[PDB]
Amino acid sequence: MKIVYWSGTGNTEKMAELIAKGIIESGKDVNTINVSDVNIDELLNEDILILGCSAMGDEVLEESEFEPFIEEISTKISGKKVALFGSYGWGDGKWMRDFEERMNGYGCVVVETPLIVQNEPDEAEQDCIEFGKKIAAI
C-alpha cells in the first residue's frame, strides 16, 4: 500500500508513520511517500489511496505542492477508495470536511471517517495506529 502526505513541521509526517505501523502490524507492506517524491502513475495502480495534509492557509490544503497534486489526480480517481488524514491547529477540521467533500465529488469512495489530530500525535498515537489497522482490513 502507499501513504502520500505533505507536512510542514512533522506532525502529519508522524501521523503517516504511525498509520503505516498499523498496516504493517496487520501483516501488510506499505511505503510512506512525501508528496514531492510521488509518481502519480505508480500511485494510480493502488487499490486504496491514503492521503494526508495539515490545515494550511484559511482552512485549505497546502498550496504549493499538495493541492496541485490533488488537482492532477482528480480526473483519474473515480471509483477509487481513499482514506484521509492530517494534523491541524486552532480550527475544528474545516479543511478536512472540505477535503472529504472534494474527493467524494471526484467520485472517490471515502472508506473511513478522516483522521484528524491536533498538533503532534501525542496522546493520539494509538488512534493513528488503529486507523492504519482499519484501512488494512478493507
Ligand X SMILES: Cc1cc2nc3c(=O)[nH]c(=O)nc-3n(C[C@H](O)[C@H](O)[C@H](O)COP(=O)(O)O)c2cc1C
- Selected from 19, 56, 73, 83, the binder of ligand X by CB under 6 A is 56
Residue 88 in the binding site for ligand X (CB under 6 A): yes
Helix 125-136 and helix 11-25, axial crossing angle in degrees, nearest 10: 50
Supply the minimum distance, in Å, between the C-beta of residue 92 and ligand X. 7
Can you say whether residue 27 is alpha, beta or left, with left for phi > 0 and alpha for psi between -120 and 50 degrees?
Answer: left
How distant, in Å, are the alpha carbons of 3, 29, 88, 89 from that of 58? 25, 35, 12, 12
Residue 9 in the binding site for ligand X (CB under 6 A): yes
Return the number of other C-beta atoms located less than 10 Å from residue 130's C-beta: 15
Contact 71, 97 (CB under 8 A): no
> For residues 26-45, which are near ligand X according to CB under 6 A?
none
- Selected from 41, 58, 122, 123, the binder of ligand X by CB under 6 A is 58
- Selected from 1, 2, 4, 12, the binder of ligand X by CB under 6 A is 12
Residue 91 in the binding site for ligand X (CB under 6 A): yes
The residue among 71, 4, 65, 80 whose CA lies nearest residue 39 is 4
Supply the minimum distance, in Å, between the C-beta of residue 36 and ligand X. 14
Residue 97 in the binding site for ligand X (CB under 6 A): no
Q: Which residues bind ligand X (CB under 6 A)?
A: 7-12, 54-59, 87-91, 119
